[PDB]
A paper describes a structure:
The membrane-anchored SNARE (soluble N-ethylmaleimide-sensitive factor acceptor protein receptor) proteins provide the energy to drive membrane fusion in various cellular contexts, such as intracellular trafficking and exocytosis. Supercomplexes of NSF, α-SNAP, and either a syntaxin tetramer or one of two binary complexes of syntaxin—SNAP-25 reveal atomic details of SNARE processing and show how sequential ATP hydrolysis drives disassembly. NSF comprises three structured domains connected by flexible linkers—the adapter N-domain followed by the D1 and D2 AAA+ domains. Six NSF protomers come together to form the active form of the enzyme, a homo-hexamer.
We observed a nearly symmetric ɑ-SNAP—SNARE subcomplex comprising four ɑ-SNAP molecules coating a four-helix bundle. Even without further processing, this structure was recognizable as a parallel 2:2 syntaxin—SNAP-25 sub-complex formed by two syntaxin H3 SNARE domains and two SNAP-25 SN1 SNARE domains; this binary 2:2 configuration was previously observed in crystal structures of syntaxin-1 H3 and SNAP-25 SN1 domains and was unexpected as we prepared the complex with full-length proteins, implying that two independent SNAP-25 molecules contribute their SN1 SNARE domains to this complex. To improve the resolution of the spire reconstruction, signal subtraction and local alignment were performed as before. This approach improved the reconstruction of the spire proteins to 4.22 Å, enabling docking of a crystal structure of the 2:2 syntaxin—SNAP-25 SN1 complex into the density, which was of sufficient quality to assign characteristic side chains, to identify the SNARE domains, and to determine their directionality. The 2:2 binary complex was fit back into the full reconstructions, enabling modeling of the full 22bin20S. A representative 22bin20S model (class #19, 3.56 Å) and ɑ-SNAP—2:2 binary SNARE subcomplex model (class #23, 4.14 Å). Four ɑ-SNAP molecules bind the 2:2 binary SNARE complex, with two SNAP-25 SN1 SNARE domains and two syntaxin H3 domains. This configuration locates two independent N-terminal portions of the SNAP-25 linker bearing cysteine sidechains often palmitoylated in vivo near the membrane. Symmetry was not enforced during local reconstruction. Note that the near-twofold symmetry of the bundle leaves some sidechain densities poorly defined.
Residue numbers in the entry:
A (entry chain F), G (entry chain H): 0 to 286
B (entry chain C): 17 to 86
C (entry chain A): 191 to 259
D (entry chain G), H (entry chain E): 0 to 288
E (entry chain D): 17 to 83
F (entry chain B): 191 to 258
Write the structure that this text describes.
């Protein structure tokens, strides 16, 4: 309330002093050649002004201030502080208008990968992909960014990080009526989860999904895949999932639609499903 | 009295199944969560030790150089 | 024999109490784990920043102050 | 104990030494103009005396020395060190005199938020709220501090902390303040967890709280909101709380207090209460006429 | 021999009791450890922040003085 | 009644299996958490030592500059 | 290995040329007065020879080297380095002969307290307490060390560590039959966790133990104490522990050993007991 | 790939520049003086080329560049940048051709153990062991490396990781080495966690494998071992896995294949026999006579 109003008043004041600063500092460099200290101090003026803009609940102007400071600082032939300014501007633009946030974050990733550090590049890429997913619909860019992030993580031996990104990519790929990539990623991660002392318990789940997606093509291939997986994983038959898959196969063989639906409904009753599985099952039933 | 026998039995089976499955899922996901922080702590330790070595050696060499100047 | 099934009722109620407690325990362990991770990420960010800045500053200043002579 | 007596004696000695040091520093600045060292080692004397004194189990004078040292240090254009000394002095005064601790902590928070750090400011705000409510009996200031902390946290997408703070604020407001804020906060937070990996079977309780508050307002609003939630979130249909709420609604409809009493008694028998639901239920029962 | 089946059910109930209470007791202490972890994390974070600020201000002041 | 008790037999088997699984899950969790705690302790030690060293470093360096 | 022990001999030769380095202080530092850095490198060679000894599994020699290096290095300067050397010497002495480790750790404690780093000092106090427990037999000194550590920890609001330390202190004191202290500590820790959502479920155990200790001294007051606990915590009676304690105390009204014996055996028939509880019950129930 | 095509083009450009920089090095060691700084810039450009190569997917060239840079760097009386570059080269060689990775990691380990940091050396040792077992078909060197890692860890008081290391090494040795070491390590580890009240809920399994190891040699000493175990640990006698032992030995005394087979098959229920134990049971069965 009043705090914000006063902050914005002195904010306009400080910005006026900052434009005065920049103009008279270039003038003083021309007429006296004082060096570059005045440029630096002007940079901290921009920084503190942007901080208090953020204090004042006006994000767009804060992002503009951060971007201006970053560009002047990199014009001063120093990178990392400029990097921090750009990433701060992107975080500010996250809410409200995020489009230019994409460009700035890309610039930050560009400089980071130019230096040679990779993990933060992966973090920024996943953030950008999250922005596209949450606010836009061009899922193709999301696929590209997630794949790049997974590549970076897996290249740096961060095995755990890569799996999450690959799973997200596989889910979205299966969403857009493409099945080869989903099959490959699911089976690869499932096999890589075979010997994990901790993850072994969950290793079944991924395999199950694969079979389901693999069933979208035909029936005999699905049987071959499921029996192959059962051979590769002897304990797979213990869980109810194999029972359910076998029921689905046998029912769909003999056009027993009602029993198929009732078995699905019973499995739902014992444990409910999500949108993804329900949608896939319904799409399967369509034939 | 077999009616309440059947009623309590169906209540017991349903509740037991749902509770058991919920516990199983909650646990499984916590397990899969822990590994990320494991490796994150690994990385932060690596960075911290690198910092320690670099700063220590820099300062000691700089004290030696300052003594040389003095 | 019916008092035996009454005892069965008592023990299943004991199971009820124990299982409800277990469920709530897991639900309350979850958020702590999550918040721990949410602190870890930030500390990682800051330590990386610190190491990078220290390295570059010391290296550049040292080369400058050693070669100007 | 010998340690306490000796520490107090040498602490008085060090304080007198620092006082004479500062007066002689005022003298020497004109006399010799040594720069600013005199004051800084005077500050070091003050800090060492303060830490040894706090080790000596005596608190108030320790925080007083911390405040004096930080004041004289900030007199020399050094801010962050004085701010850390302020924070330490507040932690010391926490057990001595709340008012001075609150003042110093507010000073630290303002200087920090001027610096540009928000998370530390939010942490200090939470500490201020906790001390304000735990021993001093007042809520409104606590609500304001918690709200500011949540705002600062959300400023840097630290979602979990802001979630917790807002939940506590909503609970406190519902207890004493009006209900609209509670409605909005509880409903938003609850419906911001339907999608997730572990935070998926917890949310239920939040909606239940909201329903109770709605019911506290009026019966028609109660039923309308219950239907709204029923449609919006399918799983709430099969919650035990849902059947409990329906039974309570239909019982209160006909003015048969025995049904309400037996229902609540059975609910309590199955699972233990929380001491917050019981008060609301008693208040509801108070208006059966 | 259905009574023997009931007796097997009773011993299964005994095993359920033991396993459930054992898991409960272990988990409680799991919680206490996960609380201690969160307590330590705040202190390490604060130390990191203080070191960062001190190093930054000191190095920049020295670099400015060098000019 | 017979089918009901057969279903309850299936239920007792399933409950046994699940309980056992939870038992193993918990013990593993415990172990891993303890390891994490130990590593946290060591890193905290190192960080505090670095803090002290750098503080006295800056102090001595600024005093040396003052000597100049 | 064997020739690394030969280089341990050559590291005693390193110590011999270090003896020549102190012979520098004896005569040659008159012309090398500025060789304080020479003393520093003498300390460094001391340290790396000591590390070689550590690799050689000669614990006594390694500790000797550490202590000598610390003594030479602590020339009223670089105190924290001397502290690190002292704590390293103490860790080395931990195995084999640990007595002098106590003195060195005490000196390090004094240095840190002069500095004010309380957490490390308290941790080292815990270390000396546990080595006292596991190697020597004195317990009262362990009690004093634990008390001092708990005070230091509680100074800086690190409550949980202080609570566990006080719990161990209470257990030891109860083994030493000074019940007032044990009951005080147990009651404090019990009723200081009732209203936080993370430690909420432990309370029962603490109360139970407190009850027993109370029940040891004045049985008549035990009933009032348990009633006070029950009313303070409504959900205390439901737990099995309160029921068992009620059965024991009510049975004791009549002299019937069989009743309590069967009760305790039945309780043990659901979970095993510990030495502490079993010993306390055996001692107390004798009269 | 056009991206990778331009990446490799600029990689070749930087390689030509680095060749010109080694020409600079030879012209500044034999032609000029003070090239140490010039070859330091050469090292900087080499590190740039190596990192960008790593980004280019050409792992072998990246590793070669890292190794060349490190070996050139070693000549400037600097050891830590040596370590870093050697470790980076080893990580690069991990994939593709790992043989020389072993040598470079050994060099780095030597440097570190010369310096004095032990924990990092132990971590690199365990990495060497894991890569050697996963991709190289040989196990005895794995035993040696795990042994050294265990020595280092238990020397520095980090008991926990040491415990697992020793456990794995002993378990593996059981498969292809005399069982005495297995018995020793298993017995040692059992009691060394029997006390702490969390890790100790599991030692049953360790004592169980120890019993299997004893049994695989002879029966009588196995009976003595099991009776001693249950004498020391009263709560392992009235256990579950435990009885499998009494029924199995009683059956084996009578030389009756059917009962032993049905007993192990029975035990299968509610816990799937794993790869190791199964092999053990088959091995003991094969020599019933």
């Amino acid at each position: 309330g009043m705090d914000t109003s006063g902050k914005q008043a002195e904010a306009m004041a400080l910005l006026a002093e900052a434009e005065r600063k920049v103009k008279n500092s270039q003038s003083f460099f021309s007429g006296l050649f004082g060096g570059s200290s005045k440029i630096e101090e002007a940079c901290e003026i921009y920084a503190r002004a942007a901080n208090m803009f953020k204090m004042a609940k006006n994000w767009s102007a804060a992002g503009n201030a951060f971007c201006q400071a970053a560009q002047l600082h990199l014009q001063l032939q120093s990178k990392h502080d400029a990097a921090t300014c750009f990433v701060d501007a992107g975080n500010a633009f996250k809410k409200a208008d995020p489009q230019e946030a994409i460009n700035c974050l890309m610039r930050a990733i560009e400089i980071y990968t130019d230096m040679g550090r990779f993990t933060i590049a992966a973090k920024h890429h996943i953030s950008i992909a999250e922005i596209y997913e949450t606010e836009l619909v061009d899922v193709e860019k999301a696929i590209a960014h997630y794949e790049q992030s997974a590549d970076y993580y897996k290249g740096e031996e961060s095995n755990s990080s890569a799996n999450k990104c690959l799973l997200k990519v596989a889910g979205y790929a299966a969403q857009l009526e493409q099945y080869q990539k989903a099959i490959d990623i699911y089976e690869q991660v499932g096999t890589s989860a075979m010997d994990s002392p901790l993850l072994k318990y969950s290793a079944k789940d991924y395999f199950f999904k694969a079979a389901l997606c693999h069933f979208c093509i035909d029936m005999l291939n699905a049987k071959l895949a499921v029996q192959k997986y059962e051979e590769l994983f002897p304990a797979f038959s213990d869980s109810r999932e194999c029972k359910l898959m076998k029921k689905l196969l046998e029912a769909h063989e003999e056009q027993n639609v009602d029993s198929y639906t009732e078995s699905v409904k019973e499995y739902d009753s014992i444990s409910r499903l999500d949108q993804w599985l329900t949608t896939m099952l319904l799409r399967i039933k369509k034939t | 009295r077999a009616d309440q026998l059947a009623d309590e039995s169906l209540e017991s089976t349903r509740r037991m199944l749902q509770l058991v499955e919920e516990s199983k899922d909650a646990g499984i996901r916590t397990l899969v969560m822990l590994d990320e922080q494991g490796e994150q702590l690994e990385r932060i330790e690596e960075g911290m030790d690198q910092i320690n070595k670099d700063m220590k050696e820099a300062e000691k060499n700089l004290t030696d150089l300052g003594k040389f100047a003095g | 024999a019916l008092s035996e099934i009454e005892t069965r009722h008592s023990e299943i109620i004991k199971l009820e109490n124990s299982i409800r407690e277990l469920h709530d325990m897991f639900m309350d362990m979850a958020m702590l784990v999550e918040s721990q991770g949410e602190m870890i990420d930030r500390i990682e960010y800051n330590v990386e920043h610190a190491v990078d800045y220290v390295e570059r500053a010391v290296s550049d200043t040292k080369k400058a102050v050693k070669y100007q002579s």
